[PDB]
Amino acid sequence: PRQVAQTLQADVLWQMGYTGANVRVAVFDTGLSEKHPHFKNVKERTNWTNERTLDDGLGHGTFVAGVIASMRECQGFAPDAELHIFRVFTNNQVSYTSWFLDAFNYAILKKIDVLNLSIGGPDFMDHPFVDKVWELTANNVIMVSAIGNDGPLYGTLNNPADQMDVIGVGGIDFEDNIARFSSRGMTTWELPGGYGRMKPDIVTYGAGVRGSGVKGGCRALSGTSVASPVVAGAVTLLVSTVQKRELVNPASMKQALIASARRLPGVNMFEQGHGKLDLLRAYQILNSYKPQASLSPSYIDLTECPYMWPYCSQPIYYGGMPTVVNVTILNGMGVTGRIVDKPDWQPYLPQNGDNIEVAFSYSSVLWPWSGYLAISISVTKKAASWEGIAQGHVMITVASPAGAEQTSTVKLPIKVKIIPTPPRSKRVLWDQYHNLRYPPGYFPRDNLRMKNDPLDWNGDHIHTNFRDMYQHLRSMGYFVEVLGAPFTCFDASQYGTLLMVDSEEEYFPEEIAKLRRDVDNGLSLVIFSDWYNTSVMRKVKFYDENTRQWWMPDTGGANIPALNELLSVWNMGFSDGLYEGEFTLANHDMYYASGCSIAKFPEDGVVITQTFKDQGLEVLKQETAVVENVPILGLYQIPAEGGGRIVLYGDSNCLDDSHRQKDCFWLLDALLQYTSYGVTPPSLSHSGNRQRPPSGAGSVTPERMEGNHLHRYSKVLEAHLGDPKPRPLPACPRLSWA
Template identity: 50%
Template sequence: MLCHYLCFSWESYQILENYQPRSSIFPSVLDYTDCPYSWPFCRQPLYAGAMPVIFNATILNGMGVIGYVETPPTWHPYDEVGNLLSIHFTYSDVIWPWTGYLALHMQIKDEGAQFSGLIEGNVTLNVYSPSPPREKGPRSSTCVLYLKLKVVPTPPRSKRILWDQYHNIKYPPGYIPRDSLDVRNDILDWHGDHLHTNFHIMYNMLRDAGYYVETLGSPLTCFDASHYGALLMVDLEDEYFKEEIQKLRDDVVNGGLGIAVFAEWYNVDSMVKMRFFDDNTRSWWTPVTGGANIPALNELLAPLGIAFGDKILNGDFSINGEQSHYASGTDIIKFPEGGYLHSFEFQDNSESGATQNILSASGMTKVSPILGLAEVGKGRVAAYGDSNCLDGSHMVTNCYWLLRKILDFTNRNVKDPVLFSDSAKTSKPLHEEESQLPLRRTDVNFSSYSSVVGKDLICHHDTRFEVWGTKGYGIHQLLTGRNRKRYSTIDMVNDLNNTMIEFNVEVDEATTHKGSGNYSGLVDRNKSRNSIDFLGLLNNDEV
């Protein structure tokens, strides 16, 4: 035992004795042909017109506790096809202590729309550190990151899906309650709600089905809807800019975009009951919204004639032999005429619903609509009141089969005979008075948690390079100046252009971001967030 220890110590000494101080990048390789090690990057190739793929690496500086990036990173392709790759960099100007970051934002140029093959090359970065005692001049080193990227021709619109990540409130700062209230050991929605975390099984399923899935981490004005068959909106908690609401309406009605919405429970009375005192932070925690932000979703979907309610529904149901579990989902209370609406018998576990059930002589269950599909203008919309069947965290049964059928409809107008049966077709609009729609909490300062409330509409680093630091596509043409358009709130019974709403939007100048290597139009996404308290907690009652 002693010999083993001494030998190990001697080997360690020899390594340190022979070590030449240098800097390096970890990981040093991004290889799209190396699966599953390079998952999720290896799961989907690059192609022209896609949102940039962002790869984050760590700069390790062994030359000193502090270091500096001497020159911006550079891309060195192995051959001419490497020039089809466009890379923008963000990185640490100062590397301290010992480490920094390097982020690659990669997209294929338009001239590579038909290219199929591999792109290989190196990204190099020069780092220097001040000289230590007894050395002359600073230490310097060159870091190398090897790239091997798979590229395919741009897929057709019907095969492309855009995942809305921007309107998911990240954990922390706020108390965002769990999606399934039956789960007692997870009180917070802290699993990421991302394609590469608790939705990774769904992501792999979509890739296996031949779909290309991209992520949008910016407002809905920051993507070109003509490139995508469907916008996938799952378990979203944030608000929406008015420009987003108007653009999405236009994208669907006039642009033919499909939307698939998977909502969650929302009930103010139940949220109030979930308030508790946390011993660690010695403060009161109260939910800032429900499993999803239904009032915000209803505003977004209002021009399409769709709204969700405030029930908390639980139970099992079956569609064409497919058994599913509805876990703390909500109901649909508005839907357009001519759409297809599916209702099932569930138990209402909301505070108001429980009271009604106790007083009711008809029992504890009630038939509620939970799934709707409709054609709206040139586009197609699907709404479902629960996302737990897509979430791998606490799934009882999956509904991937339903998602595939929904995408067949939204992307290619393929109508499943069961989902689009005559018995499910609505002869008149499902309607609820505006006063009966779920309301926002008035006792919560939502701006502390939101990327929308109190913030500027801006396209961030994860969007196409041409809209970085702007308000997005078509804002000047659609909403300002002489070319200002007027948009309608859709009356599904009459005409699509009855009620006109006008919005005036001023486009701000993009601010610059010092950390950009090749681009100056970047915006600091953390603007206006300096006021967030520890964990963003509300009702801080110190004891």
């Protein structure tokens, strides 16, 4: 049978006397048995749950500990590792963040070198937890964490594996293929204004790996909760191999794993990281390593890929939104660093490297053991018609305390592709600014049937849970840039269409006025709405165990009252009735997951309506009812000459990737064609499902649920708690190109 440790040539390092000796490993899991025979060096087991037992009822903590440090019948990487067992989950995999805080305090107290966290969470706004993790890494704790078992959907990264100071470990099968369960995508802390970093850091074997059984023997498990312990054991063995232990810090260890990693062919860097763990090359790199700074990715090649997806899925032109690469600076010279000067952007005149201007944003202090360097790359005015590879290198001098500063000068190659600006139509502005989501507040699932996932938490970015939709658009020719700022902060003459999908945010009055001016000037709007209903919202309240609190939705599927405030300037509106069911449009199947209807639409709209199920009645009184002629989609061209277009659709799940049933990528393509070219889509204007556009007369308009708390998580509304009002319009972000 398979031996995970042997397959990664852990034996070749066992022959050298390096077996994880004098390396402290902590396992944050469901616990371990008292006298498990697969371990010789389990120092202590601690229970931080409310269940009165240190033992492992599920067998997960035992398997993790075995993979890391098993000696019998299925060996771990570091048999001589000092195992520390932290039972912070119950038999059902339930853990309170306060228990995590206490356990992490304990871990820092014990000075553990490697910490495996196989089960994370989507709540990266759990500020006590994230502060604790930063505190942990700052204290010289190499934290290996599983990126999560919520793949292959992008935007599914789990905290703390998504932190710059934590080794995120994804899962491959023993054939070196990324495991289906393995989480993917960029970090989403930085949305909407920013861009996400590169995760996972590395990917190792996490499917079918044999590990210790609860009482003995071995059994096969799967998940990044399995890949994470493999990397943790490999890191423990590597720590034992290095001669100078002072050279071993989270940054140096991460850098050894990053440089020695074997790049998987055909896998983008946001699925694999730098590659699969290579233990022997990692040993060699640690052997030759000296304290230095480095960059993840270490080069910015918007051409070389699939490794550099999404950065190669489109080239950069003039007038495009700045291309932001969040480069993780790994500084092995000290826990705190400092960028010495404004990084020196040295272009290459010989090969046309001066067609790029690179602005730099970055940490004032590089901490803990790392930091960020957001490089905003923008073409110049001269290159607005110049195709080609612009090449330069960004020289970053990271300095760290000693007396002389530990100057590490790092070259960041920047090899970007450049093209002339596309027409208005090809450029699509995806609205990220008006998206609200979990972690912060309870924004319910866009599909009420999906009881398993009751939160909208996958970022809703074109590279996170709309990755399939974005890839579809790229294959369709659309260049999809992201609006991370209010409507007032983008040149509407650049874009033919603005795509607002499952928007939960409010709107500034200045935002509404500017958007109306944009629409009159030629900007188009594609508003993929989602369900809203005060009664369904009240019935869909759920008990969050993490907080031990009864959560009510802050808004429905989409902020239908706010969207109606925005749309009132065009006489349009949305209803509050829940509707659902399979249907068809222009010979294409569909699925209305959980959406609202168009309560109010002007007379000249090219509307389409069909029959669905009154899912609101199902939610409230568990009854059944089919609703005749529920308008779900509406088209409207503004009469003003050179005016925009507005498409209204009631559900957002046909584009999301979370739990897709059917596909409307065809319909979104048609709607973008409508909003960017004017030609009417026959799939809806010659459809037999047309009808008189509604009027909203007599139908009570949806209202914000009494006592809602959306203002607590709104960039637009102040947390006034009494008649909340929009904040003053914020100043548009600006960059000083270097």
